[PDB]
């Protein structure tokens, strides 16, 4: 709901890192 909802063709480290930090609660 944050990784696949952003991942494009070869980009994901951006949305992934964002979700990884947010889920760092």
Q: Token digits for 17?
A: 């890192």
The helix or strand, by DSSP H or E, that contains position 8, with its residue range, turns out to be none
Q: Are 9 and 17 in contact (CB under 8 A)?
A: no
Q: Are 2 and 22 in contact (CB under 8 A)?
A: yes
Q: Token digits for 7?
A: 């991942």
């Amino acid at each position: 709901s944050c990784k696949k909802e952003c991942s494009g063709s070869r980009r994901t480290k951006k949305c992934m890192q964002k979700c990884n930090r947010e889920h760092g609660h």
